[PDB]
């Protein structure tokens, strides 16, 4: 599946498709079928084996090169989607992931404002991925 | 206050959570452990709002 | 694929399936025999993966003798054609070739149509009645539907 | 408790259709083919799942 | 490097709808279709 | 475990033999019969917890959507599993945890 | 809120999950604002009615 | 939902003992509801028994077909229901 995985992140399959690995049932699905709804996220760096770890992929030099239009020897939305930055994931895939609802939560923090809203504590697990 | 109270709710739910997982939960007449579980989740935190 | 046979009602508890352009519900046995794998020990090794489930054989026991008496090919492709709304008179000589078309194509056309692949048929159908024991044996949650 | 059954069939030697009579004995497992036109009678063995087109079938096959 | 503010994930967004647009999975979808469906049921 | 004769490959059933006053397995096909080990025929469990713990699996651990603990495994004592309530789906089940040691794999509780 | 997903509310909570924010506990007031895991639950509540 | 609302006499009403009582004489409770394992054997022998489990049970109480019958009832089921063999 990491394999696979690599292929659909640098364009050598067609990013559309769906890389499903259920472990619980032992069963492994993919999806090149017409008409699934998918969405953009960006990819976190999930591999024990970089300092990268822990962070979100895609970088100001990305974003710089997006400003700009090309790369430093058209440069747009599906650029990044052949760079490794951002996937799409369907219904199916969506089921399988962890997903941080702004970049701010990928790391903890070190407030008492009684006019702003409280942030959930997420104390059930100890670490998330 | 306000804030305080809904702490101390969600600590509560803790322990009822804690309870039912160590087998140390009452059961309520006519109904199944995840029922009862459930029901006295929800009073706790209609009470507390 | 439907499991008859209520909570203590309904006495053997057998599993007939549905096939296109056949009028009558036929038994899963019968229908793996008339794929060309029929002793009992190979129908099993295809649908059951964990020979220690009991609760899982069990269930199959009365399927195997409600088809007991359908000992080979032949005699099962014949019975399939005498269900599929065909024309009265159409003998056992020719019977079996016109239930071989309604098994080769319209049954799970999705995996092949061509000739010589039935392997890949015997195989999926039983998966198909593993999948439909988990749910009955309360081991897997029925299907959301919305989902 | 038997089966006395009318069916659409024609007889293979009569040749008048819808005068098939099928007579399905389960407890001893013996299906009985009647003409209402002509009189002959046919008879062979049946299972528990047969119905008169399992034993018109082995009829057609019994003459030819 | 550094961290990706609020203002950066805006960026992101307008090269998609730079590229795309609102109502792309219908033109591409009827491109598909004349390109080659048509051809394949022929 | 319920078996099939070596060489017909069809089902063997239970028959007494009455002469020598034994238990046999008999075929159905053929006239090959053996001994039988074992005089239970039959159970019907009731009040049954087959397949609570049952779905073990090797790659278990390598969900990111599983929570994780610190759990001492009593195997290695290694401060890394993940865990789950029972994947049993009657409506009676019980919600205590089972974790997983990912290194040996053993299922326990916190009763 | 039932596990519409398989064993949790949303993919942005961990598996078996029985928490007061997992199964549709909004702690912040109208005034404070809902936060995006809230926002959808408030949004299923009121869809039903 | 059908529902009976079954008011007890006075004497009765007023000691919790004896509404017990009452309780356990109404409620319905089948053979099913006891039993957690039923099993055949093969028990050629009719005095005496290949399971070493029930040697001692069925030597000791004695001092037709060869299947036997054997179903086992719930210790706590039958304690909470108040049922002696
Ligand atoms: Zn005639
Ligand atoms: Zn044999
Ligand atoms: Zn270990």
Redesign the pocket.
């Known amino acids: 599946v990491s394999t696979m995985r690599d292929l659909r992140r640098s364009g050598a399959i067609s990013p559309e498709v769906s890389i499903i690995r259920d472990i619980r049932e032992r069963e492994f699905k993919i999806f090149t079928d017409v008409g699934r709804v998918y969405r953009p996220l960006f990819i976190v760096e999930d591999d024990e084996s970089k300092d990268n770890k822990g962070e979100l992929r895609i970088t100001k030099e990305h974003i710089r090169k997006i400003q700009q239009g090309y790369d430093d020897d058209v440069y747009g939305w599906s650029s990044l989607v052949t760079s490794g930055v951002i996937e799409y994931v369907d219904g199916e895939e969506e089921e399988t992931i962890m997903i941080a609802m702004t970049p701010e939560d990928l790391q903890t923090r070190s407030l008492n404002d009684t006019a702003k809203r409280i942030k959930p504590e997420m104390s059930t697990s100890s670490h998330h991925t | 206050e306000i804030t305080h109270a809904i702490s101390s709710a969600k600590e509560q739910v803790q322990e009822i959570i804690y309870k039912a997982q160590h087998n140390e939960l009452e059961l309520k007449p006519g109904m199944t452990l995840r029922e009862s579980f459930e029901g006295e989740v929800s009073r706790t935190l209609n009470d507390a709002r | 694929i439907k499991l008859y046979g209520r909570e203590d009602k309904g006495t053997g508890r057998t599993i007939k399936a549905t096939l296109p352009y056949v009028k009558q519900d036929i038994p899963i046995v019968i229908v793996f025999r008339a794929l060309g794998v029929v002793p009992d020990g190979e129908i099993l090794q295809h649908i059951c993966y964990d020979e220690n489930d009991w609760q899982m054989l069990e269930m199959l026991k009365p399927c195997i003798e409600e088809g007991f008496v359908i000992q080979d090919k032949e005699v099962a492709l014949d019975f399939i054609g005498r269900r599929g709304s065909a024309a009265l008179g159409i003998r056992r000589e020719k019977r079996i070739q016109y239930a071989k078309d309604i098994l080769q194509k319209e049954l799970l056309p999705h995996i092949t149509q061509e000739e010589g692949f039935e392997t890949r048929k015997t195989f999926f159908l039983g998966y198909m009645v593993n999948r439909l024991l988990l749910c009955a044996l309360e081991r897997k949650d029925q299907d959301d539907r919305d989902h | 408790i038997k089966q006395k059954l009318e069916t659409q069939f024609t007889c293979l030697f009569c040749n008048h259709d819808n005068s098939v009579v099928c007579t399905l004995d389960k407890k001893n497992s013996i299906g009985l083919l009647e003409c209402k036109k002509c009189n002959l009678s046919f008879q062979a063995p049946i299972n528990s799942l047969s119905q008169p087109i399992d034993i018109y079938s082995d009829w057609i096959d019994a003459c030819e | 490097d550094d961290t990706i503010t609020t203002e950066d994930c805006w960026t992101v967004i307008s090269a998609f709808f730079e590229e795309k647009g609102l109502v792309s999975q219908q033109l591409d979808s009827f491109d598909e279709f004349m390109e080659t469906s048509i051809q394949d049921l022929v | 475990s319920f078996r099939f004769?070596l060489?017909?490959?069809?089902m063997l059933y239970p028959k007494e033999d009455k002469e020598n006053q034994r238990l046999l397995y008999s075929?159905?096909?053929?006239?090959?019969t053996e001994l039988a080990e074992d005089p239970k025929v039959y159970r019907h469990e009731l009040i049954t917890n087959i397949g609570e713990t049952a779905g073990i699996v090797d790659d278990i651990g390598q969900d990111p959507t599983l929570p994780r603990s610190d759990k001492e495994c009593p195997e290695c004592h290694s401060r890394d599993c993940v865990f789950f309530q029972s994947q049993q789906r009657r409506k009676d089940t019980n919600m205590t945890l089972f974790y997983v040691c990912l290194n040996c794999k053993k299922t326990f509780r916190d009763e | 809120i039932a596990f519409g997903f398989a064993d949790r509310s949303l993919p942005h909570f961990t598996k078996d999950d029985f928490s007061p924010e997992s199964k549709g506990f909004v702690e912040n007031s109208y005034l404070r604002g809902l936060t995006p895991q809230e926002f959808f639950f408030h949004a299923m509540a009121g869809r039903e009615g | 939902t059908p529902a009976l609302t079954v008011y007890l006499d006075r004497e009765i009403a007023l000691d919790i003992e004896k509404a017990k009582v009452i309780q356990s004489s109404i409620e319905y409770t089948t053979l099913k509801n006891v039993t957690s394992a039923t099993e055949i054997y093969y028990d050629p022998d009719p005095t005496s028994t290949v399971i070493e489990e029930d040697f001692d049970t069925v030597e000791a109480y004695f001092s037709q077909s060869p299947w036997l019958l054997r179903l086992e009832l719930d210790r706590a089921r039958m304690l909470d229901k108040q049922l002696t063999m």
């Open positions: 004769c060489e017909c490959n069809n075929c159905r096909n053929c006239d090959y």
